[PDB]
Amino acid sequence: MTDIYIPPEGLYFRLLGFASRQVIFARNSPSPDVGLSPVNDQATDQYFSLIYGTGEHAGLYAIKSKATGKVLFSRRPAEPYVGQIDGDGRYPDNWFKIEPGKTYLSKYFRLVQPSTGTALVSRTHLQPYFWNHPQTEVFDDQYFTFLFE
């Protein structure tokens, strides 16, 4: 830990996008099993918790779905670029850095996957609505905030 807010391990939250105004979901379904859904749904499949990385993954976090138990991944170049997988963080592309925003994004943060060099995206208009982007090129649709029960 540092001064950066990190939810306690295991605490549930939803992840609201700055640009999209929607929350990520993860469900046990055939493809697609992840996406965005509306905040006022208040659905269990919009909840996640963090698994704290340890050893070489200290200071990174896996994002575990409450509804499925799988963790999110973010990758390039293999498609789909984002999704979920079992294993509580068994793969390198399951580990994220919480990177706080500056100026008008101080309540928000990016979710950057450092080894593949990608950042999660939550957007309107252009599909896929939940996706990623190379993390060197920053737009405000890469920003998220936590919502709690």
Resolution to 1 decimal, in Å?
Answer: 1.5
Q: Which two tokens mark 90?
A: 């068994």
Q: Which two tokens mark 68?
A: 């499925």
Query: Could you state, in order of their start, the residue ranges of all structural domains in the chain?
Result: 1-149
Calpha distance 82→149 (Å, rounded)? 25
Question: Which experimental technique did the depositors report for determining this structure?
Answer: X-ray
- What CATH number labels 1-149? 2.80.10.50
Nearest CA to 35 out of 97, 121, 118, 135 is that of 121
Residue 63: which residues within 8 A CB-CB, separation 6 or more?
15, 48, 50, 51, 71, 72, 96, 111
Calpha distance 12→102 (Å, rounded)? 25
| Chain centre distance of CA 65 | 10
Nearest CA to 96 out of 60, 50, 47, 58 is that of 60
Count Cα atoms within 13 angstroms, Cβ side, for 148. Answer: 4
Cβ(101)–Cβ(88) below 8 Å = no
Secondary element (H or E) of residue 130: strand 130-134
